[PDB]
């Protein structure tokens with residue numbers, strides 16, 4: 312709770328507390344769409360969110376986390392590059408100060424206005440805390456946001472943010488359907504990587520959807536009204552909470568589509 316996104320505590324500093332920041336499988340990365348190899352071996356991706364059950368939303372001083380009840384076999388990601396089954400625990404976003412930046416992954420160096428991360432843990436390790444200690448512990452579905460038409464399924468999120476403005480505030484947040492945040496297509500890129508915030512663990516199979524979602528300007532402007540600070544400290548708007556692209560280091564990015 313000293314790391315952040317600023318000049319003196321941002322991404323270029325994180326390696327001091329977290330040496331893995333300079334590791335061999337760090338995220339995000341630029342997705343070079345011409346270099347990515349179509350992989351006919353990938354099985355169909357399966358997103359089964361019909362029983363997802365949200366519990367709460369928290370401003371953690373970095374982003375806001377929508378946390379789900381993951382105590383039962385509900386809200387599962389499987390197939391694609393995955394072996395076994397991964398359970399949804401939370402989602403969050405990364406976004407910019409301006410529409411021209413905000414995403415963590417880039418596509419041929421293109422930055423989107425924001426990116427959504429749906430975080431799932433491998434059920435073979437029994438819970439999230441043990442899964443993050445394993446190289447195949449997590450599967451994160453990444454979805455790019457562009458500014459245009461509103462996303463009606465985002466509006467419940469946008470409307471609770473005024474209740475969690477500052478670091479440490481949380482609220483009850485039930486019956487949120489994450490299916491309303493998906494694009495039409497499940498075409499994706501996949502590669503082995505890491506968490507994009509400290510502790511930067513190399514435990515993620517990344518699945519980045521090719522098709523962005525559209526959100527309105529007014530929706531992302533409400534993201535940018537959150538605060539990094541806690542109440543009673545100077546106001547610092549919660550913007551630019553994205554780590555830039557890291558070295559690919561001879562990993563391969565595979566495409567699900569030709």
Ligand code: NI
Pocket residue numbers: 312313314
């Ligand atoms: Ni700290």
Ligand code: NI
Pocket residue numbers: 403404405428507
């Ligand atoms: Ni993230």
